Write an enzyme that holds these catalytic residues in place. Structure first.
Site, short mmCIF file in Angstrom:
data_model
loop_
_atom_site.label_atom_id
_atom_site.label_comp_id
_atom_site.label_asym_id
_atom_site.label_seq_id
_atom_site.Cartn_x
_atom_site.Cartn_y
_atom_site.Cartn_z
CD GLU A 133 -2.50 -1.32 2.73
OE1 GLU A 133 -2.16 -0.53 3.64
OE2 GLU A 133 -3.44 -2.13 2.86
CD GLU A 240 -4.50 -8.16 2.84
OE1 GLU A 240 -5.21 -7.71 3.77
OE2 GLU A 240 -3.40 -7.65 2.53
#
Lengths: 355, 356
Positions: A133, A240
């Site tokens: 990220e 995820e």
């Protein structure tokens, strides 16, 4: 019949595992992992604040238990994660004397940490989330601790993958991010990967976090993302995956600690944001089924471009979505309920490959 | 028929007026104020940061205009906010040399400010929100800039209403707060009023701001609130009434800067949070009508214990609820639309006292 067996021809089908699965304490879940999955990602125990909490201290105990656990049960081991702006202690970004790290001191701290972590688990961990990220919603680099202290977004990413290539040459190297379906963010990730490839630096695939909901995102955005990534000669992965079913959060992914505000625990908000404490209603349980169905219908159709699909947990009680972004809620994001029984969503997912 | 005319024998019916209504610029709203409302509150021009922006500096010009504006129709003039933790400059809480004020130095700043504001408008302003929002949701005092610098919560309220009584003896003194329907916060206000009464410090009314929505709060909580405040012997008012119709914020009142986050401006959230960008759909207009109807029916049933019901604006286009708590939204909180036409809710509100 089994998740890993039904999707055997398409991609690896894995899950996240917490300390309690790895220790054996959560007996019911660990049993489902061996049955249904062939890849595991360590929920938390491999992050920097657990691995190297303070200056001068290391703690690989829990991560060592995870690696051994996976090998024992024959799992595709995924380390998560090496370089990340969150869950990384203050000492990573300062000298011993309190000064903010210079570009060179920050990269040295990156090199040393990767060598400590990835270099420890060579031949045991098959795949690393190297950078997690770093791209913002507009597609540019995020003004994060790592980016500021190094001084250049391109430089941060480029070095982390090069250090991972050096200290774990056996391991596949992935970039992982949320909202990777967003056009503006997607174009940024492509840009970054393309700078990695022309630099000669290794990168095996882009991981789409897949923290989605009932009303987001559009299949167009997802498909167009999978395409855009696979076209760069790299693997694509849903890493995820969970489907948020609660008010507000089913509409979009939330970051920050604004929803953790005291005010949302008050009755009028409690009774709206957490409406399913007594259980998940027939119609919403059906929605969750249909939503999973159409997404895996997409993943299975695009099976040639996808190396791995992982759900971020086994049973609903395990989920991070019960306490994030709003603490104290009763969510139903995963494929098995609180009694570890299959949900009508699972039946649909296992049906997809043959359908 | 007008609002003030219909509600004459129950309570004053008022509105918030901005600088634009006062300046005559928003003349469309101005006419509706002269038509429907007999009490007025300045939306902003009497708050600390306006009237005392910097150390040794005063700007009473825009407030002066508001008082002069209120003379032409002879409205009940409510001065908005003497002591409040928000919209109060940081110089209020520090000495000239940077240091934070002592209990005595902070209480002096309170006194000097009240003298300058409340004392300036004697005979012209009828009432003051002396203290705004000081009780927390659990009932205890909020740890505000005033509270920390003075040192104690009770001392803030005790002094604020004492100084107000001194420099504005003619004026009625109110405490004003949001969520004032919540049992825990209600007891905190009741506790605070009782303490003021036992100390012989002047307090005349409790104002429930009334920044509400479609799904909150229950009529019961509102009713128990009115009952509890009236049993104290003070006047109850609905001071800043509006009804939020947009998602999330129709469920409860939000404070702080949480929803000001870049993420709620992203297309997936704007999609959800701002669904009525081209007028309210019929089903929701009726929902607003019904909401305003059942609420004013409550006020009118309980008119004996109520002194004033003020709506926080005239037409929707200038309502603070458009940009707060989530900026760039199109909300429909008030009684008139963006063309200054009566919304279905107005006719329901006006019919309430006549209703059989």
């Amino acid at each position: 019949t089994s998740l890993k067996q039904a999707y055997a021809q398409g991609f690896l089908l894995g899950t996240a595992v917490n300390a309690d699965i790895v220790s054996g304490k959560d007996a019911a879940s660990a049993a489902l992992v061996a049955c249904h999955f062939n890849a595991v990602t360590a929920e938390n125990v491999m992050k920097a604040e657990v691995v190297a909490p303070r200056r001068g201290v290391q703690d690989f105990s829990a991560a060592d238990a995870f690696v051994a656990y996976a090998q024992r049960d024959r799992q595709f081991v995924v380390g998560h994660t090496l370089v990340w702006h969150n869950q990384t202690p203050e000492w990573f970004f300062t000298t011993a004397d309190g000064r903010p790290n210079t570009p060179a001191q920050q990269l040295e701290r990156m090199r040393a940490h990767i060598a400590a972590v990835a270099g420890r688990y060579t031949g045991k961990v098959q795949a690393w989330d190297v950078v997690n990220e770093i791209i913002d919603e507009d597609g540019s680099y995020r003004s994060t601790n790592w980016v500021q202290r190094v001084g250049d977004g391109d430089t941060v990413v480029r070095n982390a993958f090069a250090f991972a290539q050096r200290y774990a040459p056996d391991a596949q190297l992935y970039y992982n991010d949320f909202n990777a379906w967003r056009p503006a963010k997607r174009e940024g990730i492509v840009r970054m990967v393309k700078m990695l490839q022309q630099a000669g630096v290794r990168i095996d695939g882009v991981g789409m976090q897949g923290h989605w909901g009932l009303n987001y995102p559009s299949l167009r955005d997802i498909e167009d993302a999978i395409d855009a990534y696979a076209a760069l000669g790299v693997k694509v992965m849903i890493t995820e995956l969970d489907i948020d079913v609660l008010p507000l959060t089913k509409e979009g992914q939330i970051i920050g600690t604004g929803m953790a505000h005291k005010q949302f625990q008050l009755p009028e908000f409690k009774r709206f944001l957490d409406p399913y404490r007594d259980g998940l209603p027939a119609d919403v349980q059906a929605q969750l089924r249909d939503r999973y169905a159409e997404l895996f219908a997409l993943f299975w159709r695009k099976r040639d471009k996808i190396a791995r699909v992982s759900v971020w947990g086994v049973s609903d009680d395990m989920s991070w979505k019960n306490d994030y972004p709003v603490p104290g809620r009763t969510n139903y994001p995963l494929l098995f309920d609180r009694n570890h029984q299959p949900k009508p969503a699972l039946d649909a997912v296992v049906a997809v490959p043959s359908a």
